[PDB]
């Protein structure tokens, strides 16, 4: 099938977001592991795999629509130097996803591509959950304190890479 050019442009920009999120989350999780925050690392790693799945889903749809998935381009990674900065870095990307997909979904349905819209509706709900998780962590750090919060991210006894 031939996809609509604007829908393909949109799926491709979202693809770039996902490939960027894969790297950002993956690296965060590895850095978290290396700092001793092994319990938190497991969770960030899983976020990474969800992004891998998003990238795949989008690639499929781009191919089905006879487009060219862009695996060449990445956005700028935000590599945080502390737990708080890492949550904010990943929060920043998730909110860029909303800014895009909120009008994006509406644009797909105007173009009468319900299937693309539904696919992006599913990704949006997944990213809204990530946002929810991240925002709650930053809120928890505020309530517990950085030290105390970080203590909930290590195993007993603390472990390593």
Can you give the binding site for ligand HEM, defined by CB under 6 A? Answer: 19, 22-23, 26, 49, 52-53, 55-56
Residue 103 sits in the site that holds its own copies (CB under 8 A): yes
CB 13 → its own copies: shortest distance, Å? 17
52: annotated binding-site residue? yes
Residue 85 sits in the site that holds its own copies (CB under 8 A): no
96: annotated binding-site residue? no
Q: Which of 34, 53, 85, 92 binds its own copies (CB under 8 A)?
A: 34
What's the 3-state SS for the chain?
Answer: CCCCHHHHHHHHHHHHHHHHHHHHHHHHHHHHHHHCCHHHHHHHHHHHHHHHHHHHHHHHHHHHCCCCCCCCCCCCCCCCCCHHHHHHHHHHHHHHHHHHHHHHHHHHHHCCCHHHHHHHHHHHHHHHHHHHHHHHHHHHHHHHCHHHHHHHHCCCCCCCC
Residues at the binding site are 18, 50-54, 94, 127, 130
């Amino acid at each position: 099938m031939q996809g609509d050019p604007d829908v393909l442009k949109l799926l491709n920009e979202q693809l770039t977001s996902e490939l960027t999120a894969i790297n950002q989350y993956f690296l965060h999780s590895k850095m978290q592991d290396n700092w001793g925050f092994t319990e938190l690392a497991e969770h960030t790693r899983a976020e990474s795999f969800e992004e891998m799945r998003h990238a795949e889903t989008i690639t499929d749809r781009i191919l089905l629509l006879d487009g060219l998935p862009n695996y060449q381009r990445l956005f700028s990674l935000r590599v945080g130097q502390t737990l708080r900065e890492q949550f904010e870095a990943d929060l920043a990307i998730e909110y860029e996803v909303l800014e895009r997909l909120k009008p994006g979904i509406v644009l797909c349905r105007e173009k009468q591509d319900a299937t693309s819209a539904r696919l992006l509706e599913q990704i949006l709900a997944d990213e809204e959950t990530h946002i929810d998780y991240l925002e709650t962590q930053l809120q928890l750090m505020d309530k517990l304190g950085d030290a105390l919060y970080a203590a909930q991210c290590v195993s007993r006894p603390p472990g390593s890479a």
